[PDB]
Design a protein around this ligand. Structure first.
Ligand SMILES: CC(C)(Sc1ccncc1-c1ccc(C#N)c2ccccc12)C(=O)O
Length: 435
């Protein structure tokens, strides 16, 4: 039944989207005796916060620097503000503290993922995406030798185990290994679902593809509701991996008891296919893992994209079945690129338009993925359509560089968004050349 796998793919989106909710960075500041010690001191907490922490970006108190001595210059109204020296700051010798405003417990507050060592979150995202990448390649021969159903049940068991274990990870490398194994199992489940849905009924390939895509997009609203319900990342991972226990228990019928040579050239087809897959994967896994910076509220943005991705994909399927594959794919790619470029150009003051443009770009890249998945079954002969596997591998490899590009934010907050807007434009400009 397609319902059982559709539910699993829905929770698979939840497990994939948990990389953004669990790695959320709430408002944090360094430990200070004027704010964290006893109230009896030798009033006005904002003044103490200002005199204890030097200002940083967006006129906010810095998150990785603290004054070695109380700077009373920010207290006297007649004093010249913004005139202290750099030597009066210390590299946070007393640690940091976290405010439980939007989130009460995350992996950032546990292992101290402050901006001083902010590379740990993109590194963990890249490790998860590498586990997704190597998961599809290794599960190929595993499903070919052991069978798709047995390895599917084993991947469900591994998903449950690594979900119940990641919530109890005491160290950062242990959590990274748990996420790697979880991503391996996720990639195995995805490959099995893909190889089963294609050979299920298919002329009915686009219908089942759109159904699976809608079941996956339901995962956005699912994880939004779960993150609005529970606020602890451990309890979140637990309740997200709980349904996979029943998914594994669904085994045994509910307790019954191809290589090619491209020496002359790229032949104008596989190069463009891999380029579009790379672009889709890169923009998707670079824009979905940083939803906190794309809108004012993470849950609101998630609900918005979850409620907009369904009619967007419906219209994408409509244009795919009504006016072809290449023109609608190029149009969706260009629309997503222009939307991300406008989101980059629009200042951070207008949050509503920013969230709308981000939702439109995500819908556009989803429509482009749907089109390139429908187009992958027609651009190659019946025996060459290895092509879909190569395209998925190229998309995963492009996703690998997704979180790594976000590290370029030290030079400017718009450069990652600039790339996320420029890549779809070139992808759509190159998509028009498809036969
Ligand atoms: C690696 C991906 C993008 S898959 C994938 C891997 C891990 N987390 C989520 C997805 C995913 C992303 C967008 C989708 C859409 N639309 C989608 C639909 C069905 C199953 C997975 C996804 C590929 O194969 O290139």
């Amino acid at each position: 039944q397609t319902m059982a796998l559709m539910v699993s793919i829905m929770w698979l989106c939840t497990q994939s989207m948990l990389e953004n909710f669990s790695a959320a960075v709430p408002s944090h500041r360094c430990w200070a005796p004027l704010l964290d010690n006893s109230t009896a001191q030798a009033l006005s907490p904002e003044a103490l916060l200002a005199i204890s922490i030097p200002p940083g970006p967006n006129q906010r108190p810095h998150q990785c620097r603290r004054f070695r001595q109380p700077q009373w210059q920010l207290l006297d109204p007649n004093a010249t503000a913004t005139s202290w020296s750099e030597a009066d700051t210390e590299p946070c010798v007393d640690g940091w503290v976290y405010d439980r405003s939007i989130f009460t417990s995350t992996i950032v507050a546990k292992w101290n993922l402050v901006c001083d060592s902010h590379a740990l979150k993109p590194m963990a995202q890249s490790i998860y995406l590498a586990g997704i990448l190597v998961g599809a390649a290794a599960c190929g021969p595993a499903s070919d030798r052991f069978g798709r159903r047995l390895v599917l049940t084993w991947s469900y068991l591994q998903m449950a185990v690594m979900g119940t274990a990641a919530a109890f990870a005491p160290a950062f490398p242990v959590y990274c290994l748990f996420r790697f194994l979880l991503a391996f199992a996720v990639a195995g489940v995805m490959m099995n679902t893909g190889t089963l849905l294609m050979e299920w009924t298919a002329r009915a390939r686009p219908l089942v593809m759109t159904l699976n895509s809608l079941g996956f997009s339901f995962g956005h609203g699912l994880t939004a509701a779960v993150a609005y319900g529970v606020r602890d990342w451990t309890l979140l991972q637990l309740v997200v991996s709980v349904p996979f226990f029943l998914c594994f228990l669904y085994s045994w019928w509910l307790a019954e008891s191809g290589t090619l040579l491209r020496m002359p050239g790229l032949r104008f087809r596989t190069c463009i296919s891999t380029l579009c897959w790379f672009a889709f994967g890169f923009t998707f896994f670079g824009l979905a893992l940083d939803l906190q910076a794309l809108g004012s509220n993470i849950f609101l943005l998630q609900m918005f994209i979850g409620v907009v991705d369904i009619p967007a994909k419906m219209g994408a399927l409509l244009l795919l079945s009504h006016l072809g594959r290449r023109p609608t794919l190029a149009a969706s790619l260009l629309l997503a690129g222009l939307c991300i470029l406008a989101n980059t150009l629009v200042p951070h003051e207008m949050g509503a338009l920013r969230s709308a443009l981000a939702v439109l770009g995500l819908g556009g890249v989803g429509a482009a993925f749907t089109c390139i998945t429908i187009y992958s079954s027609e651009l190659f002969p019946t025996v060459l359509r290895t092509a879909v596997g190569l395209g998925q591998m190229a998309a995963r490899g492009g996703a690998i560089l997704g979180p790594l590009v976000r590290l370029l934010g030290v030079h400017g907050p718009w450069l990652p968004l600039l790339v996320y807007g420029t890549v779809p434009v070139l992808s759509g400009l190159a998509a028009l050349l498809l036969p």
